[PDB]
Write a structure and sequence with these properties.
The structure is cut from a larger assembly and holds chains A and B. Chain A contains four helices and no strands. By secondary structure, chain A is an all-alpha fold. Classes of the chains: A mainly alpha, B mainly alpha. At the A-B interface, helix 1 of A face loops of B. Chain B: It holds the Pfam family Phage_Mu_Gp36. Chain B: This is DUF1320 domain-containing protein.
Chain lengths: ~100, ~140
């Protein structure tokens, strides 16, 4: 099973979940940043609070694309992580089998 | 039609209207309705010339002052020859002065029977007003 305990069935792993949702792959972003006013932004945020994340996600993408300073800051922050060396360590006082698994 | 033949008769008596309207019979016998209609139409046209810039043209109601002005101008128009010192000419000049005062915004067009006249939207116009960032966002 997974960490959360939900039962795991290997049958469903052969195909992606979204494969049976061919409608999603054909969509295009609506670009809600164009012609954006403070009232529109407030409505977008409030609607996102209620479960309509599509408009918020598209607005965030436009915001990332259209602001050079914000984009540079975010890119620098992410590249900071991307350059870190990483390793996999066994648990506290692990045994030989655990060390081999790690 | 701010005034009618009845208004002219009431203001100037039927005898005077007959005398200044009957041009073919001497002495006069009847009032010529066509001549009176043309005189009233001319008075209305002059009044509209004076009032076009502040009110709608096809007024649905006739203010009383407008009735008096129209009657005076119509009577002045029924005279083929009108000299400067004729008192009717002086009355017409006073009424024209009243009209000019109304046009220049010094006098207001009074009540018709109980309600106000209908001013034009000349003063209403403003650009539109751009005040984003002030809509309780």
């Amino acid at each position: 099973v997974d960490v959360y305990g939900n039962p795991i069935r290997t049958q469903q792993l052969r195909e992606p979940q979204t494969s049976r949702l061919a409608g999603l792959a054909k969509e295009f972003a609506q670009h809600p940043a164009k012609g954006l006013t403070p009232a529109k932004l407030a409505r977008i945020l409030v609607e996102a609070e209620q479960g309509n994340l599509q408009a918020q996600a598209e607005l965030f993408m436009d915001m990332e694309e259209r602001d050079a300073h914000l984009f540079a800051e975010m890119s620098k922050r992410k590249r900071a992580i991307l350059g870190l060396d990483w390793a996999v360590e066994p648990p506290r006082n692990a045994s030989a089998a655990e060390k081999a698994d790690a | 039609s701010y005034c009618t033949l009845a208004d002219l008769i009431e203001q100037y008596s039927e005898q005077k209207i007959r005398e200044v309207s009957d041009r073919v019979n001497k002495p006069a016998t009847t009032i010529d309705t066509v001549i009176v209609d043309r005189a009233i139409a001319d008075a209305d046209s002059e009044i509209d010339l004076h009032l076009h810039g502040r009110y709608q043209l096809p007024l649905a109601s006739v203010p009383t002052a407008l009735k008096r002005i129209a009657c005076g101008l119509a009577y002045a128009n029924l005279h083929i020859v009108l000299k400067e010192e004729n008192p009717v000419y002086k009355t017409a000049e006073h009424l024209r002065k009243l009209l000019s005062g109304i046009a220049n915004g010094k006098l207001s067009l009074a009540l018709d029977a109980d309600g106000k006249p209908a001013p034009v939207a000349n003063t209403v116009q403003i650009s539109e007003g751009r005040n984003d960032w002030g809509a309780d966002w």
